[PDB]
Amino acid sequence: IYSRLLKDRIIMLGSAIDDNVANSIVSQLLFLAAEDPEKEISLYINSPGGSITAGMAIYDTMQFIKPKVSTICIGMAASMGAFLLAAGEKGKRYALPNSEVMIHQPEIAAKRILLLRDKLNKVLAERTGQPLEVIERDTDRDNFKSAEEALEYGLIDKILT
Amino acid sequence: IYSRLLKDRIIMLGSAIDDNVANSIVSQLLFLAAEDPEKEISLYINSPGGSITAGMAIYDTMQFIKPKVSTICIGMAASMGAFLLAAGEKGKRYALPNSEVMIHQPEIAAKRILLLRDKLNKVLAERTGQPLEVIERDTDRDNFKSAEEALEYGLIDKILTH
Amino acid sequence: IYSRLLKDRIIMLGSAIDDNVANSIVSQLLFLAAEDPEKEISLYINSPGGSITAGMAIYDTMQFIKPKVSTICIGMAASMGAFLLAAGEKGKRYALPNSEVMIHQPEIAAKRILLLRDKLNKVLAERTGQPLEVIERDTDRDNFKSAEEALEYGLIDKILTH
Amino acid sequence: IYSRLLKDRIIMLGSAIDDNVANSIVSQLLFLAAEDPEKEISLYINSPGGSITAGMAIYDTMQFIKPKVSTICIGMAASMGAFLLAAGEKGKRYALPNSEVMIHQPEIAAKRILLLRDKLNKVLAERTGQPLEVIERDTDRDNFKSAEEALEYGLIDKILT
Amino acid sequence: IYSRLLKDRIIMLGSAIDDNVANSIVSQLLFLAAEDPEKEISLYINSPGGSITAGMAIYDTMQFIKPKVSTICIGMAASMGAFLLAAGEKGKRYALPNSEVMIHQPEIAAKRILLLRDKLNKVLAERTGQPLEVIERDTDRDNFKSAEEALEYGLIDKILTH
Amino acid sequence: IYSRLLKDRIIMLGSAIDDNVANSIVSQLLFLAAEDPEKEISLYINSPGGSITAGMAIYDTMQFIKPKVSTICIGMAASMGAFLLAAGEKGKRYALPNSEVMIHQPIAAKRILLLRDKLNKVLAERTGQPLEVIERDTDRDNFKSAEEALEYGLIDKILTH
Amino acid sequence: IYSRLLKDRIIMLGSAIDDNVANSIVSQLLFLAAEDPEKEISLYINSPGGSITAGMAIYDTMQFIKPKVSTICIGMAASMGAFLLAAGEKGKRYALPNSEVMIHQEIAAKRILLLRDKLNKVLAERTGQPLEVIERDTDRDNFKSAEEALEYGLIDKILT
Amino acid sequence: IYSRLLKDRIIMLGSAIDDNVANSIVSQLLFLAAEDPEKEISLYINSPGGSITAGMAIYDTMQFIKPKVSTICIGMAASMGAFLLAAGEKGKRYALPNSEVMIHQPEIAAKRILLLRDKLNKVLAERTGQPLEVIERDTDRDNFKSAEEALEYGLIDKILTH
Amino acid sequence: IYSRLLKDRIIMLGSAIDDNVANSIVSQLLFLAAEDPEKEISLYINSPGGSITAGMAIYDTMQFIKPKVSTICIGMAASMGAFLLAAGEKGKRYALPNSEVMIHQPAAKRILLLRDKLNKVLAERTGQPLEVIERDTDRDNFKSAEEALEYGLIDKILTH
Amino acid sequence: IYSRLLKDRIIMLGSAIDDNVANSIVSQLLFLAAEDPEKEISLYINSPGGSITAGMAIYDTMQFIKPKVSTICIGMAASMGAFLLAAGEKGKRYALPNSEVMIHQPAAKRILLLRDKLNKVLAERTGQPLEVIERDTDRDNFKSAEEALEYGLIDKILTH
Amino acid sequence: IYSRLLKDRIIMLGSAIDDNVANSIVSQLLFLAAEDPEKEISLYINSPGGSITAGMAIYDTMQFIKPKVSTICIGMAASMGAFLLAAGEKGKRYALPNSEVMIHQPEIAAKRILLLRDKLNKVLAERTGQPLEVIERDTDRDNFKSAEEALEYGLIDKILTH
Amino acid sequence: IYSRLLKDRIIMLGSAIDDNVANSIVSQLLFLAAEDPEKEISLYINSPGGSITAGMAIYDTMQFIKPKVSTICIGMAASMGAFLLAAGEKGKRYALPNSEVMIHQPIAAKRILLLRDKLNKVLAERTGQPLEVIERDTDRDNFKSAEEALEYGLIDKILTH
């Protein structure tokens, strides 16, 4: 199926993000960018989130490729799912009226994670317009946002009705 | 099989609704809207229902896409199954004579659940043209409606008869 | 296989009836009706029967679609399998000489079961010709009907021979 | 373990009620009543509930035996768990301050169930002091009671602090 | 557990009756009869019933041993469960006020079953006090009898009350 | 595979007969009769036999359809396998020189008695043996060689070289 | 449990007979014979039967040991179960009123035929039926009530 | 083993808290209170935490029984594990020097969850002598405390040192 | 894969022979004979052997169909595998230089029947007197390809 | 159970012989020899046989320990089971009337070594000339208890 | 078995260290300390190591209890296994001549890992005599120490010989 | 069982040697040495061998404890099994007449090289063979009979009758 979706340049990120999913998503992105570098991509996101390392891979692939990546939150975008939502092409970041967004993000790899988390926070500040310290507090805490709360925090540009 | 059905723009929702099913249904909806934005979709519903979050995802995708989504209840629509039935395109919401509807609605975020619940009651009120306090009473409790009580309540537009 | 059968508009109901089987059968019915609304369908039945709710779903879908559904009992039609047999298109309900029919009918709510039994009983009365009360007794009792007994009772229209 | 509890005449009903559990509980009740007919029994209840047929078996065994059965709700008593709580010896029905009670209760066996349900409602009316019609509405609806709401509905005699 | 029960001469028959259960129950019976031939046995019964062959094994062992076997129905005694209940020591056959009895009885030669069915109807006739032919009439259809109805019918001696 | 065989109108009955197999075989028979009602079908039988109800279903479907059904015994036809062999189209019932046939046949007890009688009858008719002897021989263990099956009138022909 | 039974010299043969069961039963027989060679053993039989080779092992162990082995049919004794029933100590072979008996029974082929012949002979001596009569009845499907089993010579006494 | 521990009135809570664990812990508590109502109990806690409903059950049983319950944190007490640590007998709440405490707290009844949560914050406020608004801030977010920060915050009475 | 082989009229018998394998092989043989009755079939055999009944079914199907069946032993043909090798079309029975052949063969009454048929057929295929066949079937011996050629089990060794 | 048997110095060898079984049996033998070096051991054998290496380990342990090991064949002793039967203490090797014995035996170099040792030992236990042993080990034959007594595999048949 | 060992106050740590093993070890330690607070304990270690959080739990329990804990390395002590070895009672830390020690240390939070590594490093420095910075380098590197190397570094007190 | 053997101070090493087995064997050795330091231990060995690290652990525990450890080879001692056999108490190293010994021995690669050298040394010392020949023979497939193991000095005695 998602194969048919693929021909329409729609990627569905429908699950927790791990390496597998991250490889899969990166592949699809690279594939589409291969077919038609000039043409837009739609990434739909319903995800509880997942590993920061897996998430950053997708994010990097998004920033890297030529095609603009529009993001659309459907049920939920939490953790790295919310991050990817926020990292969509500007003015192209979308949510449905009932969808929810939670920006909360969960050896010697530890040093590495702390660094990635710092990068993550900074990107999020830039994309949202929030101050870094605000982003820090909010990603360390359990909080939920309605499509409307997320529009007004700067995570999405438009609520699609 | 349902693949063949898909070519005819029929989606079968035949099970309890969870994230998997919700992803599947959403995908099929997006896919069909992709092929042909202008053209109608038939959603057949026999479901015991399920998670309000998974249900709202399907509901949003339905409202969002261009194609009108006709809903048809076959055996049963309960919980989010009844909600989706009720959320079909107006004049296009259908049941079979012996089918049953139960609007009773039974991990994260207690507060989210409560919010979704207010909106679910609200959407039900608009679509059935029913008073909120009534919608609230009947979603709270075990009750089943026949194809006849569903229609009269405003849950479906018409009953399809041989 | 069954797939090849499907191209010939034959559906095989060969097992106990549950939600899965009911979904499957309903789908195949909707599929065939989609291909060719005008053209007949053959439903072969060898089934011990099963859930009344699942059975009624198949029945409603049968009554609902355009194509006429011929029913053919092969080994056995018991419970909802005998009901579906009896619900075949008139003059098109068939059995094999050695096949057997038992109209005895044994997640869900109790009042719903009772509502559905009355309904299934009424339908049976219409189809067999029998008085409602004769049906009520025979569904509560363990009996088998030979094909000839079956044809006499009104469950089938014709027995298949040399 | 619960073996040691047994010697102290404590039964723990810690799970959903099915036939198994119902057999087990009935056995223990009959066993204790065997040892010492004169002496009290303590039934602790943390249960999501279960089958009305299984529940009625325990209830019947409770009413039948000589020993008075005190009931104590710990986490939760729902469905037939709430019913058994309510069916404890009078003035002996107890809950903990944070416990919860839900009296909501979920072929041709159908006729039988409808009858058992009627019996169930009536017993509950008697034990609570509620009118039958009130019991009917409340067991058909999803509702939760604090220890305090349950004390004041008549499901328990005492909140143990 | 059950083991503790066993020391008090209580056997729990808590399940459908098959060869395994039947072997188990027979063993316990022979075991208790071995310990103390003179002393009574309590057999508690909550069972949907089961195989007539497995049932008759337990029955024969009951009749055979010295100890008197009291029977007590708890939730339900159906099929061979109801039979064993009825086959308890006279004046010792007991039910709880809400328990239910159903005397309906649905690798083995068909004639073996036919004969064992008759022999069952006869034993049951002599145990109830009911005439053979009425028992034959009753057990070939579904019914269910309350504790009150089974008392009347001669299936049990006493209801456990107050 | 079998699928390729199917295109040539060969059905292989290679296992014990239960409802599954019976359904499968019936389906294949109905399917072939659907494609070409006029044209012959070859049923190869190597089977230990099985349920009389499942057997009679296949037998009925055989007698019912238009295509003539030739039967060929390969290793063994016992129980309902032997019966189906015997029920092939007349002059079309075949065995291989080393194959064996055993007509011994081992829920409604009243009904299985009926089918048993009906079986015995059909057997008497096709073999032309006394119903008297058919009842002896199906009630006891007996193995016939391909020759012994010829004399009995269970098969018309033994296939050689 | 059957452990407690064992202390009372009761063995329960409650299942199809295979090598495992046969080993078990043989062990228990040898064990009891070890404890008290002089004292009787009670073998209760409810069995659909099984392998002739596994059966003959139990039968041989029975014949071999000193203790007399009484046999009691409870639900059913078929195949080698019926054989072992028949092979109980004389005057000690028992059935319950409703129990049923059915005597119907490289790749080890020549040996199966021998064991079978040996089994038919032993049933002849034990029932008092002619061999030709046993050869007939073990090749065919038939069941006997306690009563018919008494008449045929398969058991001594129906117990009530 | 923990059996031997049990004889010394030591209970080990070494895992995530669910209904099973909660039943187990409750049972052990009731058992010990049964043996010797007067005598102290030691509850060692190394737990990632878990369900608020399962946690409250243990907490209630602790408050309810006669014996004083000393709590000792070993590796970690997070979520309901930290709550139970804090709910130990006063002056008897202990941690090891390297142990960690996280008071962050992450099926039925959204409304119940919310209620339990208010009471959990409240009990934490009493026991730590801390302002509610502070307790509310720190249960809402990811934070871990050392044995030193726990003590100063008022989560434990003293740190046990070699 | 073996599907591709099948289009070339090659059947691979690569495992112990049971009913499943026997059904499979028979089916493939009947299938090929259906496509092209006139045309040869190649049966490659590397098998430890198996049941005499399952074997005889393959053998009969081989004798029965029109196409000539050439047999080729690859690693091993033992038991019914050796028998089917030997039953290949005359002049068409082949082995590879390092392959091995063991003619040892591991209702009883029917089993004893097939066993006799088997010995006779072998005796006819090899030209060996029957009584030599019967000794060699009862005993455990391997033949090198060379020995099997000289014994008359195979027509030619493949080489060069 | 067999635990109770063990206290009576009865070992039951009831299955195919592999390393596991061989370890088990050796352990039990060493254990009993430890308790009471002076006192006899009864080894009951119903076994299809098995690996020659696993077998020889049991055999060596038997020869090695002080207690005399009596062997009793119950259903069957084939392969290494037959060998261990034959290796029982002299005059103490027993079989039951219906039991069967097959002496057929199914680093290669070490395997060929044990095989020779095995034939020799048998030749010594039976009194049969070596070359007769070698024929009979290579071939597939059953001996009735009677035949095994006369062959010198067992000392006495149990009866009466 | 191990049980017999336990009566002799020997604990065997023979596997990777996770929460399970850590709970087990902690329990055994608490148990023995319960039986006889005054008397020595022998902890034998052959372990590839494991989670720092699990390791620190065992360590804290060791430091906490009254009994002195002697440590004996048998095959290998790596990661937290080498740490526990080094944390044995002074003069009581032992190894076998051919055993190996690797102090390299590879659900959880990152800052917590870092806090715990500094701590484990400090402890190691105290115990070995080494400067903190020597420990820091050696834990970040893949090296094995022979028993003699180990004794020289300060990880053990004595090597076990003829 | 083995447990009974344990009371008699017999340990059975009956399988390939891995960490589990090595732990088990070490434990049993430590246990026995705990009960009675003065008293002899009998280690029976039938083993294909295994890991050199696991082997050396057992060997060390043997050399370390007070009790003398007699070794007896039953079926086979290969690899570390042969090594442990050879490392039994002197004059206490035994084999059965038909048993076999193979001294052929097949994560820190640098370390396994060290143990390998140390093994070869101990072997040279106990057999009294040239370290020269010990390196040949452990690097190749060789099977010694009980006699051949006597000459090599791997065992002191062959146990007979």
Q: Which residue of F has its CA nearest to G136?
A: F140
E153/E145 Cα distance (integer angstroms): 9
3-class SS string, chain D: CHHHHHHCCEEEECCCECHHHHHHHHHHHHHHHHHCCCCCEEEEEEECCECHHHHHHHHHHHHHCCCCEEEEEEEEEECHHHHHHHCCCCCCEEECCCCEEECCCCCCHHHHHHHHHHHHHHHHHHHHCCCHHHHHHHHCECCCEEHHHHHCCCCCCEECC
> Any chain F CB within 8 A of the CB of E116?
no
Do residues D3 and D37 touch, judged by C-beta distance below 8 A?
A: no
Do residues E94 and E156 touch, judged by C-beta distance below 8 A?
A: yes
B100/B115 Cα distance (integer angstroms): 27
The count of C-alpha atoms lying within 13 angstroms of the C-alpha of F67, restricted to the half-sphere facing its C-beta, is 22
> Any chain E CB within 8 A of the CB of C38?
no
Question: What's the token pair of residue F68?
Answer: 């003539």
Residue E77 pairs in a beta bridge with: E47, E101
Q: Is J69 helix (H, G, I), strand (E, B) or coil?
A: strand
Residues of G in contact with F116 (CB under 8 A): none
The residue range of the domain holding F30 is 1-161
Chains F and I are in contact, defined as 3 or more C-beta pairs closer than 8 angstroms: yes
Q: Is E75 helix (H, G, I), strand (E, B) or coil?
A: strand
> Any chain E CB within 8 A of the CB of D80?
no
D133/H139 Cα distance (integer angstroms): 43
B56/B42 Cα distance (integer angstroms): 18
Q: Which residue has the tokens 């699942």?
A: C54
G104/F140 Cα distance (integer angstroms): 10
Do residues C49 and C80 touch, judged by C-beta distance below 8 A?
A: yes
Alpha-helical (H) ranges within chain G are 2-7, 19-35, 52-64, 80-86, 109-127, 131-138, 146-152
Residues of K in contact with L60 (CB under 8 A): 74, 96-99, 160
**Angle at CA of residue I60, ends I56 and I65, nearest 5°:** 155
> Any chain D CB within 8 A of the CB of C140?
yes
Q: Which residue of B has its CA nearest to A5?
A: B31
Do residues B44 and B99 touch, judged by C-beta distance below 8 A?
A: no
Alpha-helical (H) ranges within chain C are 3-7, 19-35, 52-64, 80-86, 110-128, 132-139, 147-153
**Angle at CA of residue H62, ends H61 and H67, nearest 5°:** 115
Alpha-helical (H) ranges within chain J are 2-7, 19-35, 52-64, 80-86, 108-126, 130-138, 145-151
Q: Is H8 helix (H, G, I), strand (E, B) or coil?
A: coil
Of C79, C99, C146, C162, which is the active-site residue? C79
Of L99, L104, L145, L161, which is the active-site residue? L104
DSSP chain B: -HHHHHHTTEEEE-S-B-HHHHHHHHHHHHHHHHH-TTS-EEEEEEE--B-HHHHHHHHHHHHHSSS-EEEEEEEEEETHHHHHHHTSPTT-EEE-TT-EEE-------HHHHHHHHHHHHHHHHHHHT--HHHHHHHHSB---B-HHHHHHHTS-SEE---
**Angle at CA of residue J47, ends J41 and J52, nearest 5°:** 90
Of B42, B104, B146, B162, which is the active-site residue? B104
Whether residue A47 lies in the annotated active site: no
Contacts 24+ apart (CB under 8 A), K89-92: K89/K40, K90/K157, K91/K157, K91/K158, K92/K68, K92/K157
CATH of residue B3: 3.90.226.10
The crossing angle, in degrees rounded to 10, of helices D132-139 and D109-128 is 120
Whether residue G47 lies in the annotated active site: no
F75/F72 Cα distance (integer angstroms): 10
Do residues G41 and J75 touch, judged by C-beta distance below 8 A?
A: no
Question: What's the token pair of residue A78?
Answer: 């939490």
> Any chain A CB within 8 A of the CB of H106?
yes
Length of chain A: 161
State the nearest Cα–Cα gap between G104 and chain E, in angstroms: 13
Residue type at D102?
M
E94/E90 Cα distance (integer angstroms): 10
> Any chain C CB within 8 A of the CB of E140?
yes
> Any chain J CB within 8 A of the CB of L161?
yes
Of G42, G47, G51, G79, which is the active-site residue? G79
A20/H32 Cα distance (integer angstroms): 49
> Any chain I CB within 8 A of the CB of J142?
no
Question: What's the token pair of residue K51?
Answer: 């989670």
Q: K23: part of which helix (H) or strand (E)?
A: helix K19-35
The count of C-alpha atoms lying within 13 angstroms of the C-alpha of E103, restricted to the half-sphere facing its C-beta, is 30
Select the residue from H6, H107, H112, H123 to test the D interface by mutation, using most D Cβ atoms within 10 A. H112
Going by C-alpha positions, the residue among H131, J15, D119, H72 that lies closest to residue K57 is H72
Do residues A106 and A113 touch, judged by C-beta distance below 8 A?
A: no
Residue type at I13?
L
The crossing angle, in degrees rounded to 10, of helices I108-126 and G109-127 is 150
Do residues B89 and B70 touch, judged by C-beta distance below 8 A?
A: yes
> Any chain J CB within 8 A of the CB of G114?
yes
Residue type at C40?
E
For A61, A134, A153, A154, the CA distances from A103, given in Å and listed in that order, are 21, 12, 11, 12
Go through J98-108 and write b for each residue having 16 or more CB atoms within 10 A of its CB, e for each that does not.
Answer: bbbbbbbbeee
DSSP H111-160: HHHHHHHHHHHHHHHHHHT--HHHHHHHHSB---B-HHHHHHHTS-SEE-
Residue type at I21?
V
Residue K48 pairs in a beta bridge with: none
Q: Which residue of D has its CA nearest to B144?
A: D140
CB contact under 8 A, L75 and J28: no
Do residues F56 and F87 touch, judged by C-beta distance below 8 A?
A: no
Alpha-carbon Rg for chain B in angstroms:
15
How many Cβ atoms from other residues are within 10 Å of residue I9's Cβ? 18
What values do phi and psi take at C25, rounded to 5?
-60, -40
Residues of D in contact with H109 (CB under 8 A): 100, 102, 144
Question: What's the token pair of residue I24?
Answer: 């499979």
Select the residue from E28, E30, E65 to test the G interface by mutation, using most G Cβ atoms within 10 A. E30
How many Cβ atoms from other residues are within 10 Å of residue A4's Cβ? 16
Q: Is K137 helix (H, G, I), strand (E, B) or coil?
A: helix
Resolution (A): 2.6
How many Cβ atoms from other residues are within 10 Å of residue G31's Cβ? 18
Going by C-alpha positions, the residue among L15, L69, L80 that lies closest to residue L42 is L69
Do residues D79 and D53 touch, judged by C-beta distance below 8 A?
A: no
Q: From which experimental method does this structure derive?
A: X-ray
CB contact under 8 A, L8 and J54: no
Going by C-alpha positions, the residue among G113, G127, G121, G53 that lies closest to residue G85 is G127
E55/H47 Cα distance (integer angstroms): 51
State the total domains in chain D.
1
CB contact under 8 A, I109 and G113: yes
